[PDB]
Each structure stands twice: as C-alpha cells, then as structure tokens.
Amino acid sequence: SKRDAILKAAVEVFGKKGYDRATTDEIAEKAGVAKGLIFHYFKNKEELYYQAYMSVTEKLQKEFENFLMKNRNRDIFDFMERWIEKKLEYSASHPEEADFLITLVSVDEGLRKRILLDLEKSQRVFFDFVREKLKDLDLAEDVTEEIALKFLMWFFSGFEEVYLRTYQGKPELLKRDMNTLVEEVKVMLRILKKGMTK
C-alpha cells in the first residue's frame, strides 16, 4: 500500500537526515509516489513523523508483549537481559529503524514532548512489571525496592544513549560488536543481581 511505502520511506529518510533536515519531497521520491500524495495521507510533516514513530513503536510493543507472555516466569535480571538481547538483535537487523527512533531527541520540542508522553504510556507499564518482579525477590540488606527499581531502570534506559553515542549511522560497527555487547550485558546484570539480592 502507498501509505506503508510512505511510512517506510519516512523511517529511512528521517533516520538518515534527522527530523529538521528531512523533507516530505525527499520521502515521496524515496517511496516512489507523487509529492502531494504525502498530504493526502498525512496532514503535515509533523504528523508524518508521528505516525511513522507510532507505527514502529507499536510493532515493537507487540513483540515485547509476545516476549513477555513467554518469559514472564524468569526472574527479572534474566528477563531484562533477554529483552535487551532482542533489542540489540532488532537494531542490528533493522539499523534504519533504530536510526529512526533515536532522531526523537532532535525533533522539535512540541512534537517531541507529545511523542515522549505517548511512549511513557508503555514505559510506566514495564516499570510496574519490574516493580512487581522485584517483590518476588529477597532483596539484600539496605537494597530497598525504590533503589533496586531506580537503578535497574537507569541501567535499562542507557540503551538509547549508548546507541546515539556509538552506533547511530554505523550499522557495520554494531554488527561487529553485537555479540560482545550481549556478553557484557549479561555480566552487568549478573553483577546487579548478585549485589541486589540476598
């Protein structure tokens, strides 16, 4: 469908050039459609970006729910390591999508806040699953639930920052590093498990 081709082109072009410098015309020629056809489907550039962004994050969210159904009984450290492994695999296999998602930090303030608010409406869910899994554990002395959860969420939140800093626009480098990043994530989560639990 033409709408899907436009969305796919938008992911590619926004991810290569950034929000500000990408144009709807570039997206339209990349999708192989007429320049006005963007505006048939999408009110403007902002809504094009937003719909692309929501399209990608929805697909990801469905994958996370499938994974969650299948790994819910693992302890949280194992669960999180496995999910991070999946995101690392997704990023190496869909570099343009990953490059697309990280352009959010340089989107216009109004659109960016709008999207950051939408994303919180799944992050506060995961956050709560983490909190619940934490109650299943016998926590080490002085390790409160609030500290365990802060620290784990800060660890998890650092995925995007590493990506932006090191792998954005470098698909070959991430492919080269993928298995080693997985190996390091496992050790770091084992460090946190051993330190947080009795």
Binding site for a copy of itself (CB under 8 A): 140, 142-144, 147, 150-151, 154, 158, 184, 187-188, 190-196
Residue 158 contacts ligand CCCCCCCCO per CB under 6 A: yes
Q: Which of residues 43-102 bind ligand CCCCCCCCO (CB under 6 A)?
A: 84, 88, 91
- Which one of residues 4, 20, 58, 184 is an interface residue with ligand CCCCCCCCO (CB under 6 A)? 184
Rounded to 10 deg, the angle between the 24-31 and 2-17 helix axes is: 130
Residue 167 binding partner per list ligand CCCCCCCCO, a copy of itself, none, with a CB distance cut-off of 5 to 8 Å that depends on partner kind: ligand CCCCCCCCO
Question: CA-to-CA distance for 19 and 10, rounded, in angstroms?
Answer: 10
Kindly give, in sequence order, each residue whose CB lies less than 8 Å from that of residue 97, ignoring residues fewer than 6 positions away: 11, 15, 56, 90, 91
- Give the C-alpha separation, 25 to 5, whole Å: 14
Applying CB under 6 A, among 49, 50, 100, 156 the residue interacting with ligand CCCCCCCCO is 156
Cα–Cα distance for residue pair 161/164, rounded to 1 Å: 5
Q: Which of 148, 133, 136, 117 is nearest to 82 (CA)?
A: 133
Choose the contact partner of 190 out of a copy of itself, ligand CCCCCCCCO, none; CB within 5 to 8 A by kind: a copy of itself
Using the contact rule CB under 6 A, the part of the chain among 10-18, 49-57, 124-132, 154-162 near ligand CCCCCCCCO is: 154-162
